[PDB]
Amino acid sequence: HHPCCSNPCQNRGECMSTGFDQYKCDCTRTGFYGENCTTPEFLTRIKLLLKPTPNTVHYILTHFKGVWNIVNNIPFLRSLIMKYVLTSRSYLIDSPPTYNVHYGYKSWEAFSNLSYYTRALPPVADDCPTPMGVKGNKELPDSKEVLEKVLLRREFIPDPQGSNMMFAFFAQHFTHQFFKTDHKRGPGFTRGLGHGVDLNHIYGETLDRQHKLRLFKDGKLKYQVIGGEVYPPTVKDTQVEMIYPPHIPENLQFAVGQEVFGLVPGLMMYATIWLREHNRVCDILKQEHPEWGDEQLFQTSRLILIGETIKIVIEDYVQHLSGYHFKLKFDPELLFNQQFQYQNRIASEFNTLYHWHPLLPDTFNIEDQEYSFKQFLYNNSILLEHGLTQFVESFTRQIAGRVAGGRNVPIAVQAVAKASIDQSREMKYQSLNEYRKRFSLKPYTSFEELTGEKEMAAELKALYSDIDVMELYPALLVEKPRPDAIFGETMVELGAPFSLKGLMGNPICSPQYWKPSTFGGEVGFKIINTASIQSLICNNVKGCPFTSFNV
Amino acid sequence: HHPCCSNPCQNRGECMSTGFDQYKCDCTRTGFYGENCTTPEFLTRIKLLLKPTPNTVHYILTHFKGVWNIVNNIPFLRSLIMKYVLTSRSYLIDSPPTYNVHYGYKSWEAFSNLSYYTRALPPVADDCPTPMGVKGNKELPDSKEVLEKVLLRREFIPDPQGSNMMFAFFAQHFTHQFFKTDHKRGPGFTRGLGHGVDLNHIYGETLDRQHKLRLFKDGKLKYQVIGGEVYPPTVKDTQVEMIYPPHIPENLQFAVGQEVFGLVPGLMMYATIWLREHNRVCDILKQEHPEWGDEQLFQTSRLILIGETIKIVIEDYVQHLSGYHFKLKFDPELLFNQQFQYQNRIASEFNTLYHWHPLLPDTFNIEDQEYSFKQFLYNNSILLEHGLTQFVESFTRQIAGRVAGGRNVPIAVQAVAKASIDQSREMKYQSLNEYRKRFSLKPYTSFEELTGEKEMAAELKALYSDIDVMELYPALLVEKPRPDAIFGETMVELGAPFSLKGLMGNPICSPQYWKPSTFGGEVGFKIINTASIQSLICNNVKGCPFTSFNV
Ligand code: COH
Ligand code: COH
Ligand SMILES: *[C@@H]1O[C@H](CO)[C@@H](O[C@@H]2O[C@H](CO)[C@@H](O[C@H]3O[C@H](CO)[C@@H](O)[C@H](O)[C@@H]3O)[C@H](O)[C@H]2NC(C)=O)[C@H](O)[C@H]1NC(C)=O
Ligand SMILES: *[C@@H]1O[C@H](CO)[C@@H](O[C@@H]2O[C@H](CO)[C@@H](O)[C@H](O)[C@H]2NC(C)=O)[C@H](O)[C@H]1NC(C)=O
Ligand SMILES: *[C@@H]1O[C@H](CO)[C@@H](O[C@H]2O[C@H](CO)[C@@H](O)[C@H](O)[C@H]2NC(C)=O)[C@H](O)[C@H]1NC(C)=O
Numbered sequence A, B: 001h002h003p004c005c006s007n008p009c010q011n012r013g014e015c016m017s018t019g020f021d022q023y024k025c026d027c028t029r030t031g032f033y034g035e036n037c038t039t040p041e042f043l044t045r046i047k048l049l050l051k052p053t054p055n056t057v058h059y060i061l062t063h064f065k066g067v068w069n070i071v072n073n074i075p076f077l078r079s080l081i082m083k084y085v086l087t088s089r090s091y092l093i094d095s096p097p098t099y100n101v102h103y104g105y106k107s108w109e110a111f112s113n114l115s116y117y118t119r120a121l122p123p124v125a126d127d128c129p130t131p132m133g134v135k136g137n138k139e140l141p142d143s144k145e146v147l148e149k150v151l152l153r154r155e156f157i158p159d160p161q162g163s164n165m166m167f168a169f170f171a172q173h174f175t176h177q178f179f180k181t182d183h184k185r186g187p188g189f190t191r192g193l194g195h196g197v198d199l200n201h202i203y204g205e206t207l208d209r210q211h212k213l214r215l216f217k218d219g220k221l222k223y224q225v226i227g228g229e230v231y232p233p234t235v236k237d238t239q240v241e242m243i244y245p246p247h248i249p250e251n252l253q254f255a256v257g258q259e260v261f262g263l264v265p266g267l268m269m270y271a272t273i274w275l276r277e278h279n280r281v282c283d284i285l286k287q288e289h290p291e292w293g294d295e296q297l298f299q300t301s302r303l304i305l306i307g308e309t310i311k312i313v314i315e316d317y318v319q320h321l322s323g324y325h326f327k328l329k330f331d332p333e334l335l336f337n338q339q340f341q342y343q344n345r346i347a348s349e350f351n352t353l354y355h356w357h358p359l360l361p362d363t364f365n366i367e368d369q370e371y372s373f374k375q376f377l378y379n380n381s382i383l384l385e386h387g388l389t390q391f392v393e394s395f396t397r398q399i400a401g402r403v404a405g406g407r408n409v410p411i412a413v414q415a416v417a418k419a420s421i422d423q424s425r426e427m428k429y430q431s432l433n434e435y436r437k438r439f440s441l442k443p444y445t446s447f448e449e450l451t452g453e454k455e456m457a458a459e460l461k462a463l464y465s466d467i468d469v470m471e472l473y474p475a476l477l478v479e480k481p482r483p484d485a486i487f488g489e490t491m492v493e494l495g496a497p498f499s500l501k502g503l504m505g506n507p508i509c510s511p512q513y514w515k516p517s518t519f520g521g522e523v524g525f526k527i528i529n530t531a532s533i534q535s536l537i538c539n540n541v542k543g544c545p546f547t548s549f550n551v
């Protein structure tokens, strides 16, 4: 078998076979040397002693409110701390990207082929005597058994951080622009070739699709008016391929950027809100530039909405998730004197960790109705019956579920969760503890340390035997959450760097793009730097209802 | 007409219309302010006073040969100066890229669509009152007239720098991996979607082509043996599409990565050499790694060859062109504490400036034969009859033509030269003086200043009227050359920054790739770091004939 199967190389060292029975570690720039890259250079030893742990930094960020009150109001300071926040997680993502499901060593195929998700860790080699390499049993536990014992919801566990259905659908709408698994090819492949925040879920992945969705007048997107309300256009009008069951009324077959968005009225809510936002920005730009044509109006509005999206994700969405007293800031200037690559490639592991199905409730509570999954699926008439305004008001009040902490996956989505386990295995994912080390975290020494609990720990112990072979995806959902948090440490420490890269890596954040002229003048630039989840709903939903990501 | 037609914004300020008759300049980070970004800030004024001109720097580097002989032998000094060489031309290229032929403003379409060549300067607006903006006559001079008066060769003018045919064909071979104009779509479009040194001209642009070219044993490429010599395989053998006129017999239809390389035996010479090098490197890696499979062997050989190419290009090719006494160095590490983007997008203008057709001789001299263009083109029998050893020996001896200095384009390729002017025009290229200011050069105040001569300048005066509407392409070919040099100032100053980006911007130059493990260990790494044009020929050509890019 492959001599690297045991993952001997530590601290980001790279393993390479040298003959059938031998390996060498390459410790270049790791800060370590020795056969396994385990011996610290002097400078490294100092850095390691002085560096605070993620749990310590989180404590400091979620306490001392008096300090953060001052910091948040001194702009020079707020910028300085945000600069630390951004740069601390910069050495952690390979960029240019490296590995993929088919390549456990660097290759031009892995670099150049955009159809693959990239990989933060190389796959376990094909011939390893064990699923995770060398430790554990010959077979991993039955995935159904893992799912049922420690993943499936018994009683609904509410998010102690107070996440609402506005947050849950925002998460799903946002991520589905860049997690677009090409199931025809396999779980290691994506259809989102832009690899980030390009708003293809609004505009379409291809030029053919975009041009079918565009009005070609005033930069705008096609729409229909139903009962005085602006909604996305139909499949029939646009000839735009969408996923719908045969039994759906023509006018409820909405055509939008992402093909799967008719699946959920909650997703259509955001599709409609964003469509309106685009057309609203078109109106503003036309007033500012009566000289501009349709093409420049469209393209400029698109860049602005990309900007809006990133502003909201950092300052409202990530801000909410973080639980910090410090106010995070979207400001591209902060990296201008740093070393940062303005590029991104979506990691398979980012896709995996983002399977936050425990967010979903048992019923979808709108006005006085309580919709089950069956009746809520594919049913856009619910959106039109209640209206966007009542959707917002209802979803702002309904609490979402806790993600970490175990046993909170709705049984309606049990097949998706089993698939996450099975697909992790198909893609030869390394173990939880390997991923923890990869992201500078101490490996868990027991199952009880993982869960911070006794019952699920015992069930996991009997299923896996060894903590070093525990799988990543189920570990994220059973992990001991931070104090009164939705997530555990592993979710945040893996998730933050992928996120930073996807948000700040966008070309509009680069020195040559981050200029008022890029966005049609100071008015366009202003739209971005004033955007909030509240302003988005206020400007596009009748009656400007109050909204937020928390109940 | 477009308010920005006059190109009012200076010092890299961005122009934007505000109403039908008004414009506004964006001076962000230019170091300038004022309506047209012309009045400098204090630090800028100090920065301009202390900055030497390109001609001063060029003089220094090509004189004091005794001082440079010292500096070349102190590793620390050599590294310091090479670092200065690289960084001084870094702020000059938009990365991530901006404009293209269809977009004079920044857009997601221009950023994301790899089928376009990018643009260092935005195109002149469709409705401008004058071809170049507002200056000059309603029409540019007839291209046929420009070609015949100042571009076409009467006597052959040899390169005073001594460039040989090994150099001419290396240039043609190398650049034709990234200059692959999509003639179906137009001159603004490329088929080189890797946008740089990916070696698709050896391995093929698509995985289909690669797979038809590969042996699938020992990492190797397919080949044939003729008279004990290793040559590329045939179209019939591989089923790989090549461009060959119908009269070319089955056995002389060699299949290589780039479909046009059958055009010239000089190109087939390099294709064969590089094919041999790949299989040579496969042999080495197999010895170091008896345990590797075909796939890892192929991929690792590819990364090694990419490295070899970059090394040879910098230390032999660019070294020769420069005429510097300073020994240039290929060392990715020099950029590790610098702000640099590991990405590239091929610029339309890089393509245009690289139309070095004056390099081509009147006649191709192999052994005691003197082949005309008609005889040389599409004729691989010439290669098989003489052999690679004789090709190398002959091409090493035969001098190339001077590029700058006017009147040196061979009549045989006149249609090609006329197409360069014509296509610059339909792609709406801005003027030479605009391109000079974009690259921090003083605009030419007269045609006599451009040529450094009276006769051609007078001809150009009659054709263009105004120096500020003089076209870029013909200017490069008629420009006053540096003392005893092949090129003038515009060629070097525009060319060099594009080159840096294509070479150092390659993923293998990034810190996560630049390690021995990427290349199969210390042996593979040493192949990259000791590569040269002489070693390339020595390793792969019978008898190891001496070679270089001069004499
Ligand atoms: C962010 C939170 C979130 C939510 C609230 C959510 C809500 C729901 C929901 C009820 C409203 C249903 C019926 C589904 C149904 C599915 N989801 Co999600 N999903 C979520 C995060 C994800 C992500 C991320 C993926 C991976 C996308 C991919 O790989 O294409 C995913 C994958 C899936 C898949 C398998 C791949 C696919 O077909 O796209 C199904 C089926 N699911 N999901
Ligand atoms: C680098 C120097 C160099 C050399 C030595 C060279 C030598 C030769 C040569 C004899 C060996 C022949 C028969 C040709 C013939 C051609 N060359 Co070149 N070319 C060179 C640089 C280029 C470049 C660069 C292009 C653009 C290619 C593209 O964009 O596909 C080009 C374009 C062409 C075209 C396309 C015409 C057009 O529409 O632009 C033809 C035909 N020519 N060339
Ligand atoms: C990115 O990676 C993809 C996976 O390697 C790759 O798709 C694969 O493409 C090859 C060749 O085009 C297909 O293999 C073919 O082999 C023969 C043809 O001689 C046929 O018998 C097969 O049916 C098939 O056409 C693979 O099927 C295909 N693999 C998939 C879809 O998973 C992409 O081509 C790569 N992308 C780019 C742009 O290079
Ligand atoms: C990149 O841009 C080009 C130029 O527009 C696109 O090519 C056009 O595609 C449309 C829609 O499929 C065709 O109708 C046109 O004929 C094409 N124009 C041409 C050939 O010049 C191309 O599709 C774009 N690439 C991507 C990935 O969207
Ligand atoms: C900025 O540039 C513009 C255009 O180059 C200048 O506009 C004018 O320049 C001359 C000075 O007034 C006028 O005689 C011209 O009519 C007009 N130019 C054109 C093409 O219409 C303007 O002066 C400049 N502004 C500053 C502050 O220097």
Ligand SMILES: *[C@H]1O[C@@H](CO)[C@@H](O[C@@H]2O[C@H](CO)[C@@H](O)[C@H](O)[C@H]2NC(C)=O)[C@H](O)[C@H]1NC(C)=O
Residues within 6 Å of the ligand: A006, A008, A034, A035, A036
């Ligand atoms: C770093 O590499 C590992 C390889 O996994 C280690 O080798 C093994 O360590 C085990 C536990 O100590 C031994 O039981 C096992 O026999 C051993 N295998 C060997 C020596 O071939 C190396 O000891 C270690 N090297 C260094 C220098 O620390």
Ligand SMILES: CC/C=C\C/C=C\C/C=C\C/C=C\C/C=C\CCCC(=O)O
Residues within 6 Å of the ligand: A085, A089, A175, A313, A314, A318, A321, A322, A487, A491, A492, A493, A494, A495, A496, A497, A498, A499, A500, A502, A503
């Ligand atoms: C700019 C973002 C980078 C760092 C922000 C600091 C801390 C992150 C805090 C909480 C985030 C929680 C979990 C991370 C996982 C997914 C969220 C990423 C959001 C996204 O970009 O899709």
Ligand SMILES: CC/C=C\C/C=C\C/C=C\C/C=C\C/C=C\CCCC(=O)O
Residues within 6 Å of the ligand: B085, B178, B195, B196, B197, B313, B318, B321, B322, B344, B346, B487, B491, B492, B493, B494, B495, B496, B498, B499, B500, B501, B502, B503
């Ligand atoms: C994808 C493109 C990437 C790399 C191209 C590499 C080399 C192209 C070579 C020269 C570019 C054109 C003109 C420059 C001429 C002489 C260079 C000498 C001055 C110098 O750069 O040090």
Ligand SMILES: CCCCCCCCO[C@@H]1O[C@H](CO)[C@@H](O)[C@H](O)[C@H]1O
Residues within 6 Å of the ligand: A148, A149, A150, A152, A153, A154, A455, A456, A459
């Ligand atoms: C509703 C989700 C559970 C479906 C059947 C339970 C699968 C067996 O799982 C068991 O569940 C019990 C109840 O939570 C626990 O006490 C056990 O620790 C667990 O192993």
Ligand SMILES: CCCCCCCCO[C@@H]1O[C@H](CO)[C@@H](O)[C@H](O)[C@H]1O
Residues within 6 Å of the ligand: B148, B149, B152, B153, B154, B411, B414
């Ligand atoms: C021999 C040097 C010629 C001097 C340059 C100006 C004359 C070029 O003129 C052109 O020459 C071409 C060559 O075949 C012909 O095809 C054209 O008919 C002719 O107009």
Ligand SMILES: *[C@@H]1O[C@H](CO)[C@@H](O)[C@H](O)[C@H]1NC(C)=O
Residues within 6 Å of the ligand: A374, A375, A376, A379, A381, A382, A383, A385
């Ligand atoms: C769809 O929604 C309507 C209310 O808008 C509801 O009454 C109906 O039962 C739903 N239909 C299905 C098929 O569940």
Ligand SMILES: *[C@@H]1O[C@H](CO)[C@@H](O)[C@H](O)[C@H]1NC(C)=O
Residues within 6 Å of the ligand: B374, B375, B376, B379, B381, B382, B385
């Ligand atoms: C091709 O080259 C051969 C020499 O090998 C020469 O005799 C012949 O004339 C050439 N073919 C043509 C048609 O030009």
